[PDB]
Amino acid sequence: QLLSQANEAFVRNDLQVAERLFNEVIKKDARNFAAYETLGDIYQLQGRLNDCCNSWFLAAHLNASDWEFWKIVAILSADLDHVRQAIYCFSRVISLNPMEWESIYRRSMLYKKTGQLARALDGFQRLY
């Protein structure tokens, strides 16, 4: 009922009311992905990117099946210097589907920045 009312308010562009209703559920469960599927949109549009990335990452630990999205979670985590989290997100991208080859390259930049090259080398051989 709360999730329907919050998503209805989101469709009405009543984003603060939508947030207040999603917060009634998030207060009971901080990992409630069913709220973040649209509350994350509110947080991204309002520039709350620090809270937005965490809303994706902590809930997606459980809700990992939207696998293409882990690339976006990894990218934003790296832009915010949450580098462990960025590598952990790219791991799920590659573990769920290796064919997202640009993700191997992007992850290899994190490896280049910190000297973690032994993980990049076999990956670049596969890319080549």
Residues near DNA (CB under 7 A) are 84, 87-88, 90-91, 94-95, 119
If the CB atoms of residues 43 and 90 are measured against DNA, the closer one turns out to be 90
If the CB atoms of residues 15 and 64 are measured against DNA, the closer one turns out to be 64
If the CB atoms of residues 53 and 93 are measured against DNA, the closer one turns out to be 93
Q: How far is the CB of 62 from DNA (least distance, A)?
A: 12
Q: List Cβ neighbours of 104 (8 Å cut-off, separation of 6 or more).
A: 94, 98, 123, 124, 126, 127
Q: How far is the CB of 7 from DNA (least distance, A)?
A: 24
Q: How far apart are CA 11 and CA 97, in angstroms?
A: 33
Q: How far is the CB of 95 from DNA (least distance, A)?
A: 3
If the CB atoms of residues 17 and 58 are measured against DNA, the closer one turns out to be 58
Residues 76, 52 contacting (CB under 8 angstroms): yes
Q: How far is the CB of 87 from DNA (least distance, A)?
A: 6
Residues 86, 77 contacting (CB under 8 angstroms): yes
Kindly report the length of the chain: 128
Q: How far apart are CA 33 and CA 70, in angstroms?
A: 14
